[PDB]
Structure formats: C-alpha cells, structure tokens
Symmetry: C3
Subunit: 317 residues, 3 copies
C-alpha cells in the first residue's frame, strides 16, 4: 500500500505530471562558410572539356527558406538551348527504325519535348524520334564521377535558433552570450557548439559525404529541447542529432537523390537562347522540436483525482 | 453498473487512452513532370503578338521550399523597362485634366512610380500623371483569356514524405519498397499511389483547373497519419485529401489569385534595362499532420484512477 | 466541502477541460506594396559614386517561401568579378610583409579565395596575400550609413491566413467577408485589420526600423488563435503580436544582422564575368499558432473521474 504511494508519487515526479507542457516555437537562421576549388575533366557531347574555377557562397548556395538550406555539390550543364526541332537523345524509348515508330504530337515522361512524328538521325546511322523543344536536348548522362564540389564536407554551417513558449512567456535562443564561438560541434567535445561541419554530419549518421554528393541527398539536423520551466529543477538547452531523410531508393523510377533543373536565358544574334543547368547537392532540413514544462495546479489536482481512487482500490486489495 | 464497466472499458479501447500519442515530424520532397506547348495570341500595347514555345521544368517551376511548390500557369510580360520619367498607365486614379491634378512627389498604391506633379499625354488626347519609375509602366491589363500554360492539369507531381516519431523512435516514409510506381492516385483505385495529377486534384476539391489557372490560386494537399505504434493492432499509412486554401475573394482590393512580379536585368547600348514579368500560377501547399500512439502504463493508470471513482459513484446511483 | 465543489466545477469551466483541443493548421499568403526612391552617394573602391533609381516590388522582394518573406533594405554591389588571381583585400589577417607570410593553397574563413602563397601589393606599399578567386575581391566595407531603401518603414504587408482544424472539421480564414480593407492595423484602433506597416511593426516591438535596416534583421509576426468550437460560447479570431527574433548579438564572429551574397553572371569580350551583390534587409517570419476546443464527453468523464475521488477525500478532511 505504501509502496503504491511511493510508486504513484514517483510516477508523478518522473513523468512531471505536476507540470504543464507547451509546444515550442522555432525560428532558424543559417550562415554557410567555405569555398571550393574545382578542377575536373568532363565529357560533354562526346568531347573532353575542362571545368576550372573557384566557388564561393553565391556560386553554390542561397539563403535558407522554410527552415532548410541547400548546398550544391555537383552539376551538369547544357548550354545554347533554343526553341526548335531536334532529334531526342537516343534512349531505349526514343529510338525509331522508321518514321512509323514516332507518333506526331506524342509526349513522353523521359522526353523534354513533343514529338513531330518523324524519325531522324541523332548521330551516324542511329535514329531517334524528332521532337520540338529546347535544342539540343540535354544528354541522358550520369553526374561527374567525382563530385565537382566534393570539398563541401569541409564546409561549415552556423545555426542560430530562437525558440519561444508563448503560454509560459519564455523566450530563449540556441546561442547564449559569451560562448566561445571558435569551435566545431562534436558529439562529446562541443555538443553545444552551433558550428557544424557537413562531413561530420554525414559521418554521424553513418553515410559517406562524397557518395551522396555525387547524386544529391537530403540530410536532416534535429534540435531537441527538453525545457523545464520550474525554478526548482530548471533546464532548457538543445540536443543536436543527425538523421538522413533521403529515401536512398536507388531506382530510376523514384527519381533518387536531390537534383533540379534551372535555366539562364540570354539573347545572341537576335535569337532567344537558354542555358539549362542540372543541379545536384545535399539539402539540409533543420527540424526543431521542443516541450516546455511549468508547474500547474489544475493538472496536479487532476492527477491527484486519479490517485485518490487508485489508493482506495489499493487498500481494497 | 456492469454496463458502466463495459462503457468505460470500451471508451478506453475506442479512444485508445491506454496509448500515448506523439506529434509527427514531416519532411517533404517533390518532383514535377510534364511539359506544355504554348501557342497563343496576346495583345501587347495595343498590337497583336504571338507567344509560341515549349515549356519544360526549368521554364515553369522551381524546387520546393518550405513544404510547398509552385507551378506557373499564365504570365504577362513587359519588356525593355528602364529608369526614367513616363506617364502612368491611364486608370481612374492616374488621369489628369491639367497639371493641377498631379501632385509632385505623390505615390499611389496602384502606381509603380513617384509622380513628378506634371500632367502629360499617355496616348492621343488622354492625359495621365507623369511618374518616375521603370518605363514604360506595365499595362493594367487582364491575364490571357486562356491560360497560356493551360496544359498544367496534365502535369504530374510525385511526393516523397518522410515522417519520424522521436519519442517512440519510429521512422517511416510515404513510399514503401516494391510498390508499383506506375500509377496515378485515385480516391479509390490507388489511394496510396504518390503520383498525383493536378487536374485530378482540382476536380477532387470541386474546382475547375483552367479557371484558377487564368489568375492563379493556392491548392492544398493534406496527408493524414493515424499511426498506431502497438504491436497488437498496428497501422501507419497516409491518407491523402485535397482542400482549396485560396481565399477566392474575387475583389480587386484583396489582391485575388496567386501572382507575383519578378524582373530580369540586362544592359543594351550602355543603358541599364529590365524585363518585368507578372507570373500567375497555382501554388501547392503540402500539409502533413500525424499522431503516433504506443501503449503507456502511466496514462492507463491515470485513466484507471478516474475510472475507480466513476465506479464507486455508479454503485451509489 | 461545497466550496470545493464550486472550485472544482469552476476549475473545469475555466480550464475548459470539458472541451477537447486540437492543434491548428496554418497557410500563409502575403502581398507587399510600396516603392522606394533611392538617391545616395556611396564610396566604391575609394571613389565617390551615385546610386539613383526607383525600386518597386520586383527590385526589392520576392514571394513568400515557407511562411516568411524578406524585404531588402540596403545593399553593397561589387561588379565585374571574373575568375583570376588577385591580392586579397587588406585586413588584419590578409597582410603580408614578405612572400613567407602567405601559405600556398591556404584558405581563410574571412577570405573568399585560395592563397597562391605569394605576397603582392594591393595598393601603394601595402601588401596582401595573393589569392585565386572572383576578382577583384569585394571590399571589407560597412553598409551604407543611411539604408538606401530606408523608405521600407512606409511599406505595407497584407497577410491572408487560412487555418483548418481537421479533427473538428472547421476551416476559417484571417480575413472575413465584408471587412473594410482600407485600414492600417493598430494595436487598438484596427486589431483585426491585416494590413500592416513595417515601421509600425518595429515600433510595437520597440526597435528603430532604420537601424535594423542598415545591417538587416529578422522580425516576427505572431498570430494567435484562441478558438472555441462550442456553440454556447463561440469565438475564433486572430490576435496579432510582434516579436524581434533577430539575435542582435553585435559581434563580428556571430555574423550579425541579416545579409546574403548573390551573383549575376554575364559574358563580356568572350570572358565570363559576375556581379556579386551583398544584400541586407529585414526578413519577416510569420508564426501562426492556435488551439481549437469543442466539447468532448470522454474528457469530461475523465475529469469527473478525478473529481469524484477528490470529493471523497474532501469529505474525509
Ligand atoms: C552552377 C555554376 C556553374 C559554374 C560556375 C563557374 N563557372 C563559371 C565561371 N567560370 C568558372 C566556372 C558557377 C556556378 N554557380 C552559379 O551559377 C550560381 N547559381 C546557383 C545555382 C544553383 C544553386 F543551388 C545555387 F545556390 C546557386
Ligand atoms: C516566364 C517565361 C516566359 C517565356 C518563356 C519562353 N519564351 C521565351 C523563349 N521562346 C519561347 C517563349 C519562358 C519563361 N520561363 C522562364 O523565364 C523561367 N523562369 C521562371 C519564372 C517564374 C516561375 F515561377 C518559375 F518557376 C520559373
Ligand atoms: C539589387 C539591386 C540594385 C540596384 C537596382 C537598380 N539599379 C539598377 C538600375 N538603375 C537603378 C539602380 C535594383 C536592384 N534590385 C534587383 O536586382 C532585384 N533582385 C533582388 C535582389 C535581392 C532581393 F532580396 C530581391 F528580393 C530581389
Ligand atoms: C578537406 O580538408 C582536409 C584538410 O585540409 C583535406 O585533407 C581534404 O582533402 C579536404 N577535402 C577535400 C574534398 O578536398
Ligand atoms: C513576459 O515576462 C516579462 C518579464 O519581465 C514581462 O515583462 C512581460 O510583460 C511578459 N509578457 C506578457 C505578454 O505579459
Ligand atoms: C576559444 O577556444 C580556442 C581553442 O578551443 C582558443 O584558442 C580561444 O582563445 C578561445 N576563445 C576565447 C574567447 O576564450
Ligand atoms: C490533357 O491531355 C488530354 C489527353 O491527352 C488532352 O485531351 C487534353 O487536351 C490535355 N489538356 C490540355 C489543356 O491540352
Ligand atoms: C531506435 O530503435 C533502433 C532499433 O534497432 C535502435 O537500434 C536505435 O538505437 C534506437 N534509437 C535510439 C536513439 O536508441
Ligand atoms: C504496374 O502496373 C501496371 C498497370 O497498372 C503494369 O502495366 C505494370 O507492369 C506494373 N508493374 C509491375 C512492376 O508490376
Ligand atoms: C514615410 O512617409 C512619411 C509621410 O509621407 C515621410 O514623412 C517619411 O519621410 C517617409 N519615410 C522615409 C524613410 O522617407
Ligand atoms: C465537414 O462539415 C461539412 C458541413 O456541411 C460537411 O459537409 C462535410 O462533409 C464535413 N467533412 C467531412 C470530412 O465529413
Ligand atoms: C473604410 O473606412 C474608410 C475610413 O476608415 C472610409 O473612408 C471608407 O469609405 C470605408 N469603406 C467602406 C466600404 O465602408
């Protein structure tokens, strides 16, 4: 009976049911640092070409939108596209022996254009279905074998997180005043340090940064707040963890990795032209969750209300 | 009395109050497919002009930011704007009979410029208030009567959703391994299929895609997770539903539809110039909510605590 | 004993524990209005230059992404950058007396390039470490002393918020039909008016708009919904409040304010070139939280269950 008292009172103190919990409010602001020197040889349209240059912040990233930031790690670039009629790139689905294999007006999911219904030669005696689109069509090619921006492991993301509890009227931030900002977060050595290294993040979740960097991925940074708003035992600091949100399907149908197509439009010799750029990289999604607990009398009285009956019943035995 | 027992125990099992519920964590990744052939005749500056071309992914959409993606469906384009002094476009608010109707330095919400205080002729004998801005001012014109990108119904959005329950340590994803990816979601035939057709989405919520596509809108895709983390009766799959978030006010003051203005800057003959583009389209907002429930002894003991007293009182009658 | 009855029943009615509460679903759509005339004298590369022009929506803002919109308020612009070898900008960390102070291949966090290991003259007899990057390197300079877009206080943000409660199946919006849209929100005079003035927002939270506008900041607009879904006492309207999320650290290490670097790429004389633009401004983060309460019998029965025992114990005294 008395042990039932100590187990009830303990279950209260341990589950903090005397306290009232409120969901956290998060605001995220990120600043990425690091530059990458890129020298690589890429085969474009069957001809060897040299990609050289230095990439800084403006070249490979943009500001965080919606509690997430992206870092480009690789890219394929098709230049000089213009509105016109060209043979689709030779694939299992685009190759015609005769004009009959091509259907006029047909649109294919793999194709970036609308067929004209006429079989044409893409190169040599190989024939594909002529299409109307931005010409020439981007090659169905693989990403560069070493990620051009493979240096992105050494890049550094600084995270500033502000969390508010309205009902308890308690506002705090990720970074406290006076903390030594010159640190790299470590699971043990500097768990509070907001400075993060991307490669470190990938190792923590057990993934190689380079591999993901070749085709792209979606990493995830979790910030946990177990915040206790009582003056007796008070605590409210974040706990950083890392999880890979990327599906890692590795199936052509599921469109694996993270990549997107964006174009830059220009005019030349009184002709509208466009440079298509396939972009591969790791999107980092910041997930901040929390709970704020401050003692509430009504909740304690309701638990008391369950406990009184629990006690009578324990006495009955 | 005994029926009070079966109704209490039933109310427990039915409300699952033996279980503890935890809020879901959602990450969203989307890939849009489809291309649109656009041939239309648009009246620009009182002269007929022909808009022709093929639009692919890079031409009409950009990657999802903040659990939402946008698809352009129509656009008005004003080209060659440069810093200068020009008469405002003739409206009810911009027309002056004399230099006195124009106030120097005045800014109007409808106007894109600052008045110079001088009445000038916009065309013929019609006079408007001269303003300082990007010239010439975009016409106060309606969107193209058929949406140029009216084909966007036939476009296809693939959604990959990853949800995590930290406190229960349970991570799952929208798309399971081995599922037939070649499907279009149907309310009955393929409710689990993540492939979605935009026109289907509009029909489900009872709106015509074309109409919204002319002036823009905000559609909403709801993903519900009623996830039960007990091994006895286990279940954790999404339920897709569609709701129109757009306000549909249809009042000039409320700025109805979804549209925005963005510009491309270029130089010509040593003069800075800019192409303003009004963009209309449907923004799709993905809303994922969920609840994960796994049996908890303390919660069951608290409900027990309410129930014991409820029982004594039922015996009193 | 009876006062314990009135205090229990009161605690119920006051905490509404008869009701069941459900978390709110928010969708945000914003439209910004206002234009700014910018005339200012900026010292660029040690030479005086004149910035003049009119800025409209497309020039200083872009559409909301992830329940947040940004308004540029100031900017520094470095033009003509091209891939090459140039001396880093003279700072405490970049200045070399001899070729020995520079380490070949070294990358510094303050530097935007990779050192070649050779000491060179930046200007006159002052020597910095030669680096490989976009040349010339942007000056380590302060933002313009008056914010070029200092007029942004007078700018107007219109907010349309749609909130849904799925479990209660109740959908409502921020803006009701027939409301006088011609208003500016006031703490007292027009608390429901969704039209907001940015300067008003800064005064409400007790910050000067101009100061923040010089170096950038992150403002926050909170929308509270205390929604009661019972027909007896029904209410469901928003309560707007303003909080400054910006950390206001004012330390060079913490990267204070809100700013980002973005570039525009062009070709000249068969040379790839780039215009780097440092952008300063206030990001406004919209935070919508809410709770919907509709009477639930099971919850009332559980509270009853605590209360019956509470009553027996009160009788024991
Ligand atoms: C994509 C790219 C390719 C080549 C080069 C340098 N070249 C050209 C000059 N000479 C050296 C070699 C720079 C860039 N970077 C950009 O264009 C910036 N745009 C951007 C694209 C996607 C993003 F995700 C993002 F954040 C920002
Ligand atoms: C807006 C536009 C107008 C005309 C054309 C083709 N023209 C020009 C060549 N000849 C054929 C006719 C293409 C585009 N598309 C873009 O500029 C891409 N930019 C963009 C704009 C808003 C978006 F929402 C978005 F996702 C991406
Ligand atoms: C940055 C800037 C500098 C100067 C001028 C006008 N100049 C040039 C013509 N003559 C007058 C003086 C316009 C703009 N605005 C843009 O380039 C628009 N891009 C943009 C940049 C950041 C943003 F946050 C955003 F929302 C949009
Ligand atoms: C990252 O830095 C280390 C140490 O400077 C270097 O050894 C490594 O090669 C760098 N990573 C890449 C991809 O170059
Ligand atoms: C929150 O607490 C502070 C403590 O100083 C107080 O000044 C402030 O008024 C409180 N907030 C509200 C909304 O009352
Ligand atoms: C921060 O720590 C580093 C080494 O971890 C040290 O070199 C530096 O002086 C410290 N800064 C301060 C302000 O204590
Ligand atoms: C969508 O596809 C169907 C079938 O191919 C076609 O009949 C319809 O016209 C298409 N929609 C538009 C807007 O062209
Ligand atoms: C979550 O469960 C898995 C089950 O294998 C376990 O390996 C993992 O360590 C658990 N997570 C934590 C944080 O303990
Ligand atoms: C998927 O279903 C389609 C028809 O609905 C069928 O043609 C196709 O072969 C199926 N794929 C697999 C792998 O079963
Ligand atoms: C905002 O408008 C007021 C009234 O027109 C004006 O006095 C003030 O100077 C304006 N703000 C700026 C920064 O010009
Ligand atoms: C929500 O309530 C309305 C009331 O008219 C009803 O028509 C609708 O079917 C309800 N929603 C669901 C999912 O039943
Ligand atoms: C709205 O209020 C303003 C003044 O606050 C008034 O001038 C205007 O006529 C009102 N509009 C309507 C429709 O009542």
């Amino acid at each position: 009976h008395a042990l039932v008292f100590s187990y009830i009172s303990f279950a209260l103190i341990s589950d903090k049911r005397y306290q009232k919990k409120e969901p956290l409010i998060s605001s995220v602001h990120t600043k990425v640092k690091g530059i990458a020197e890129v020298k690589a040889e890429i085969l474009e349209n069957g001809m060897k070409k040299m990609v050289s240059g230095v990439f800084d912040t403006a070249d490979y990233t943009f500001p965080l939108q919606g509690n997430s930031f992206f870092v480009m790690t690789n890219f394929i670039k098709t230049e000089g596209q213009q509105q016109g009629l060209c043979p689709d790139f030779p694939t299992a689905r685009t190759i015609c022996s005769s004009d009959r294999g091509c259907k006029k007006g047909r649109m294919d999911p793999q194709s970036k254009g609308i067929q004209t219904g006429r079989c044409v030669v893409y190169k040599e005696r190989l024939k594909t279905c002529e299409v109307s689109a931005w010409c020439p069509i981007e090659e169905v090619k693989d990403a560069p074998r070493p990620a051009l921006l493979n240096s992105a492991e050494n890049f550094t993301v600084l995270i500033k997180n502000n969390i508010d509890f309205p009902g308890h009227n308690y506002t705090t931030r990720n970074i406290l005043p006076g903390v030594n900002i010159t640190c790299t977060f470590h699971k043990t050595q500097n768990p509070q340090c907001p400075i993060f290294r991307l490669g470190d993040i990938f190792q923590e979740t057990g993934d190689s940064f380079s591999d993901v960097a070749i085709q792209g991925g979606i990493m995830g940074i979790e910030i946990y707040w177990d915040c206790n708003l009582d003056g007796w035992f008070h605590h409210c600091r974040p706990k950083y963890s890392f999880r890979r949100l990327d599906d890692k399907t590795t199936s052509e149908s599921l469109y694996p990795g993270y990549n997107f197509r964006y174009a830059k439009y220009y005019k030349e010799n009184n002709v509208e032209k466009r440079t298509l750029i396939k972009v591969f990289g790791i999107r980092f999604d910041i997930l901040v969750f929390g709970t704020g607990g401050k003692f509430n009398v009504i909740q304690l009285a309701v638990y008391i209300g369950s406990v009184i009956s629990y006690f009578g019943l324990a006495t009955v035995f």
